[PDB]
Nucleic acid binder design. Structure first.
Ligand SMILES: Nc1ncnc2c1ncn2[C@H]1C[C@H](O)[C@@H](COP(=O)(O)OP(=O)(O)OP(=O)(O)O)O1
Ligand SMILES: [Mg+2]
Length: 417
DNA sequence: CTCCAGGCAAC
RNA sequence: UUUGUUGCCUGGAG
């Protein structure tokens, strides 16, 4: 049956190679992915037997506080490499049981689906005429998952008692706080490979309810939003759907994040929309802000890196960044921040030549005319002031940065379309 | 298409 | 320090 199919050699090797590919930091017992094979070779006889019997209670997860993009802190729960290995093996077999029967409009944590699919569908509704969003998000979503309501929804498709106990064991598994196991009454650990699937299994009913009501929506994990014809209809469905998941499913809603605003006045998966009669996809203000922040630190202040290395490091971020944000239909802002990147990249180039003699040497070598060299080389104007002067645009223009290895943001934006 | 390494995004 | 799912981007071996 199922737990036999989970523990098949072929399934465990694919689960092994995943854990090893991730190179995650060790769980509570300090064994890294680098010695996962040698661990299982030594202890599989004990592990294999113990878990199929129903007795195996897994190792408690490790608590790690990390920052979230919103502002606050996220409590991680890192299982042991073997518990990551086992959870992966469960996930690999449970996926084809549940995933085909998940909603058409569910895009989070699923294979062959991404954030772009969720945004394009969301755009489709506002483009047709449903020009008001019912934005929503849940408070501490993974932490506030009730074990009984989860396992009930798991029990619908998987009838095997051995795996239901195994999944519950991982839910039950505690946290090790300075050498004591603290029991977990509610919540799946953020860090267990099986946790995202379990999250979708619970919210599967939310999709079916919204599908039953005949509502247009796009879900990506807890970030769910429903699109409507007017604000009255949007306000109506907001508190109605709020009470559904709060009583039937028992999950709290984040009222700070949840709102019934216009779609172009809110952010959905790092994107927003435009006021236009056909609503174009644009960058969210935070998406621009985070790019700026990352470019500001990559360009060297008290940091100290080689110049061509920084061009490679900026390329490596920006080319990766535009890989995701290519979905936007506004090259104007992309042209602006590309120019801004160059102005930031001139700040380092300018500060590299501190003395005027080196400035005169480098500008003359670059091909700038002798009148322009002397006019700017010995200026009282600040570094950020001199970066936007006619002289430094000429000497260190887009032509220079392209010829010295810098990848054009807007070029690759077009080349990815 | 599967596999390897480096990265970027969403949650 | 930093786990996880999922998707893509760049290079390499089949
Ligand atoms: N880096 C991550 N590692 C592991 N799980 C994550 C990570 N980021 C997000 N998740 C998971 C766990 C979260 O409960 C779930 C929904 O994300 P998110 O809404 O950002 O956090 P949250 O729902 O726990 O808190 P919040 O109250 O701030 O919305 O996605
Ligand atoms: Mg949330």
């Amino acid at each position: 049956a199922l737990l036999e199919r989970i523990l098949a050699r072929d399934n465990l090797i694919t689960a092994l190679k995943r854990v090893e590919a991730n190179q995650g930091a060790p769980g509570i017992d300090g064994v890294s992915t680098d010695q996962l094979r040698d661990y299982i070779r030594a202890h599989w006889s004990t592990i294999h037997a113990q878990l199929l019997a129903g007795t195996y209670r897994p190792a408690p997860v490790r608590r790690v506080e990390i920052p979230k993009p919103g502002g606050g802190t996220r409590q991680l729960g890192i299982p042991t490499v073997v518990d990551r290995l086992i959870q992966q093996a469960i996930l690999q077999e449970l996926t084809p049981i549940f995933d085909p029967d998940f909603s058409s409009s569910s895009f989070g944590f699923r294979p062959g689906r991404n954030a772009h699919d969720a945004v394009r569908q969301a755009q489709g509704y506002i483009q047709e005429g449903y020009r008001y969003v019912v934005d929503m998000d849940l408070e501490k979503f993974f932490d506030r998952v009730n074990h009984d309501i989860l396992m009930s929804r798991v029990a619908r498709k998987v009838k095997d008692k051995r795996v239901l106990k195994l999944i519950r064991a991982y839910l039950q598994a505690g946290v090790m706080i300075e050498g004591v196991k603290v029991q977990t009454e509610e919540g799946t650990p953020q860090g267990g490979p099986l946790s995202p699937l379990l999250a979708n299994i619970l919210l599967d009913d939310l999709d079916k309810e919204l599908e039953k009501r005949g509502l247009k929506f796009c879900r990506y994990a807890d970030d769910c939003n429903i699109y409507v014809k007017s604000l009255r209809a949007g306000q109506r469905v907001k508190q109605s759907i709020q009470r559904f998941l709060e009583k039937t499913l028992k999950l709290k809603v984040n009222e700070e994040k949840s709102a019934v605003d216009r779609p172009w006045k809110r952010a959905f998966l790092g994107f927003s929309f435009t006021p236009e009669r056909k609503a174009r996809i644009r960058l969210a203000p935070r998406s621009i802000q985070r790019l700026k922040q990352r470019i500001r630190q990559l360009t060297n202040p008290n940091w100290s890196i080689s110049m061509p290395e920084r061009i490679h490091r900026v390329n490596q971020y920006v080319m990766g960044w535009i890989g995701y944000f290519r979905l936007v239909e506004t090259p104007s802002v992309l042209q602006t921040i590309e120019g801004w990147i160059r102005r930031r990249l001139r700040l380092c180039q300018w500060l590299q030549w501190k003395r005027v003699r080196t400035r005169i040497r480098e500008l003359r070598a670059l091909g700038l005319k002798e009148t322009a060299v002397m006019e700017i080389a010995n200026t009282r104007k600040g570094a950020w002031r001199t970066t936007k002067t006619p002289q430094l645009h000429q000497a260190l223009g887009k032509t220079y940065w392209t010829a010295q290895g810098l990848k054009s943001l807007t070029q690759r934006y077009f080349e990815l379309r």
